[PDB]
Amino acid sequence: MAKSYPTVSAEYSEAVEKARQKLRALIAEKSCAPLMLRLAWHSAGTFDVSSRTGGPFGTMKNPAELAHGANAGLDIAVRLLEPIKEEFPILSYADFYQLAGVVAVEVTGGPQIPFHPGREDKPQPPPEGRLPDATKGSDHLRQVFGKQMGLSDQDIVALSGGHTLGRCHKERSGFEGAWTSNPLVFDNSYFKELLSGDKEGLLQLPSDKALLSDPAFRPLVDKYAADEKAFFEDYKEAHLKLSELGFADA
Numbered sequence: 001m002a003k004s005y006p007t008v009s010a011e012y013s014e015a016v017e018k019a020r021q022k023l024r025a026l027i028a029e030k031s032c033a034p035l036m037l038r039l040a041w042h043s044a045g046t047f048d049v050s051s052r053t054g055g056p057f058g059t060m061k062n063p064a065e066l067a068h069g070a071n072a073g074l075d076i077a078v079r080l081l082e083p084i085k086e087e088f089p090i091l092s093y094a095d096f097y098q099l100a101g102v103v104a105v106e107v108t109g110g111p112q113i114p115f116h117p118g119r120e121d122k123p124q125p126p127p128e129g130r131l132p133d134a135t136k137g138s139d140h141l142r143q144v145f146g147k148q149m150g151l152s153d154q155d156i157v158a159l160s161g162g163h164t165l166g167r168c169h170k171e172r173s174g175f176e177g178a179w180t181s182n183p184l185v186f187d188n189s190y191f192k193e194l195l196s197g198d199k200e201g202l203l204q205l206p207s208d209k210a211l212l213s214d215p216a217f218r219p220l221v222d223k224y225a226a227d228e229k230a231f232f233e234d235y236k237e238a239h240l241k242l243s244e245l246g247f248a249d250a
């Protein structure tokens, strides 16, 4: 009941469905689901509840936001999706990029995340610096996800499981390597790899390791490593919330 979703026209809803189908095909065909999940996450994760600035309002299309250090490489994602966007002028970029994130999770075998249309494309990007620093720990994660975004500790741990997709690139973040052996499969392997410690061929960031040492995050890591269904449920809820920060709030 925290949300009151806006009414959109039947044509808007039809465009959502047709764009979803084109996104599902392209993301699968081009093997770019991890980059697209990151696109949606960096689009949404800048929301700060105290000023109601940032969040999933299409501003990743803005070159000034693409230029933020944390967004290196997301220009590729924007460009890859633009041919589809051109076919759906009625859709906001805000909705389109969140839809791409939902589809990325779907096509890699993850949960089906509800999608509600109607986000506006806002003119101003957030200030740079809202997104989490991979070198920091649990206090920082709580400031970013909790105090800025308004998400719970459960959401932090579940959403960290997005690292089951993809990898770090030395020219983008400067880190290098994948968290899992199957970076195109959405599963609970991220948590299993965390629990087993570091191993040759896989990467863990300090922000990932903070989940193991924190007394509230660690039981969630244990739960998700043992129970993929519980992970998918909590991930679905967290991703839904993330994708709607600042949007349709009652």
Ligand code: HEM
Binding pocket: 033, 034, 035, 037, 038, 041, 073, 132, 133, 134, 135, 141, 159, 160, 161, 162, 163, 165, 166, 167, 168, 169, 170, 172, 173, 174, 175, 205, 207
């Ligand atoms: C918890 C705090 C987080 C930190 C510190 C963090 C940090 C990073 C870093 C440094 C990269 C590498 C970027 C590159 O070099 O290409 C990355 C990639 C990625 N992140 Fe996170 N991230 C966090 C949370 C999230 C969340 C919440 C999601 C989505 C639910 C997510 C999804 C991804 C994905 C899918 C990639 C791989 C992208 C690719 O393979 O192109 N991350 N993250």
Ligand SMILES: O=C1O[C@H]([C@@H](O)CO)C(O)=C1O
Binding pocket: 030, 031, 032, 033, 034, 035, 036, 076, 166
């Ligand atoms: O997930 C990704 O997709 C592309 C490439 O791997 C396939 O298009 C890209 O650069 C990634 O980070």
Ligand code: NA
Binding pocket: 163, 164, 165, 180, 181, 182, 183, 184, 185, 186, 187, 189, 190
């Ligand atoms: Na994986």
